[PDB]
């Protein structure tokens, strides 16, 4: 499975945040509630997709950039990436004011 790094990331409000994981990018809510934020390749037909969640692809190495732009305080929480064609281990983000 992919790595999804760092194991936890802490940033200030308005500061970008990026992880390194078809490729999906979820945030985990309770009771096994999971919502996809962005995906490689981009999902056009996804209702109400949040533009500030980007999943650029690096040159190679199967490297990827899960970037959330201009973070919000409520963006803090539980994030993981998966591959579809197997989860990768849980990497975190907290937002500071």
């Amino acid at each position, epitope marked *: 499975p992919p790595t999804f790094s760092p194991a936890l990331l802490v940033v200030t409000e308005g500061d970008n945040a990026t992880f390194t994981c078809v490729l999906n990018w979820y945030r985990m809510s309770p009771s096994n509630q999971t919502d996809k934020l962005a995906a490689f390749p981009e999902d*056009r037909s996804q209702p*109400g997709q949040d533009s500030r969640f980007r999943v650029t692809q690096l040159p190679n190495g199967r490297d990827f950039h899960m970037s959330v732009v201009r973070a919000r305080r409520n963006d803090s929480g539980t994030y993981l990436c998966g591959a*579809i064609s197997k989860e990768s281990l849980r990497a975190e983000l907290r937002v500071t004011e």
Partner: antibody
Framework: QVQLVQSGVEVKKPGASVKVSCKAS????????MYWVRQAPGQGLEWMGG????????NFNEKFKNRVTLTTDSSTTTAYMELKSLQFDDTAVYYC?????????????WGQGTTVTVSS | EIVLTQSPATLSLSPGERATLSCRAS??????????LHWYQQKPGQAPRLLIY???YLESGVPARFSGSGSGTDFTLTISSLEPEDFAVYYC?????????FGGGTKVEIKR
């Protein structure tokens, strides 16, 4: 049990509004996006909009913008389609179709269809 | 905006001959090795039924008699050995961008 069931037939007057329901059962409701397709009698298919039930985000064909409201209810796993200011050319069969939220693998499953007729 | 034009409008063959449908997009519906092109089968008075998704992939439960191919922007739905059920309309639809659109459909008939 991967099957959507839509509400009953509708016969409305021009200028009225109609609210069609689509009840999903037996899959993880928020694990699939809901889309609405219509088809005038003896014609092709026309996409109207899509909704993400996990947060309520929406897609819209611009021909129906500020004329269609798509709502969802997680409790009853039921999506709704409200077409206001009904026109004569809105006479069609209105479908709800689900799509995988992980990636687009096509509208695998469709409702039985709701016939809406606009006339004076 | 993208429009798909299925060529051509109507075909008609006996329950055995090869059926080849075409879907012909206005612009490119393929990106990063994926073509947002699906095929549905609609028999009169019922909801559509998806057969091929993402240009090549076949939907579960659908007989292997159906096959999807083509890429970049050209696509073709291929049916080899037909059965009496197979005569109906077949639509293609793109998800490359918004709004989602469908082809006008191709009706396959029984030639006598």
């Amino acid at each position: 049990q991967v099957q959507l069931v839509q509400s009953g037939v509708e016969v409305k007057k021009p200028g009225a509004s109609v609210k069609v329901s689509c009840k999903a059962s037996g899959y993880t409701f928020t694990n699939y996006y809901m889309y609405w397709v219509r088809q005038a009698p003896g014609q092709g298919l026309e996409w109207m909009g899509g909704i993400n039930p996990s947060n309520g985000g929406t897609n819209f064909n611009e021909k129906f913008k500020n004329r269609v409201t798509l709502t969802t209810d997680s409790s009853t796993t039921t999506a709704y389609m409200e077409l206001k200011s009904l026109q004569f050319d809105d006479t069609a069969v209105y479908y709800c179709a689900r799509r995988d939220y992980r990636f687009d693998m096509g509208f695998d499953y469709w409702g039985q269809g709701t016939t809406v007729t606009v006339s004076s | 905006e993208i429009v798909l034009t299925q060529s051509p409008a109507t075909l008609s063959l006996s329950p055995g001959e090869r059926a080849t449908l075409s879907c012909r997009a206005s612009k490119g519906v393929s990106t990063s090795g994926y073509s947002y092109l699906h095929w549905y089968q609609q028999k009169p008075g019922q909801a559509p039924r998806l057969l091929i998704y993402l240009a090549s992939y076949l939907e579960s439960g659908v007989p292997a008699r159906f096959s999807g191919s083509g890429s970049g922007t050209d696509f073709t739905l291929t049916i080899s050995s037909l059965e009496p059920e197979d005569f109906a309309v077949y639509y293609c639809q793109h998800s490359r961008d918004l709004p989602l659109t469908f082809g006008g459909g191709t009706k396959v008939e029984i030639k006598r």
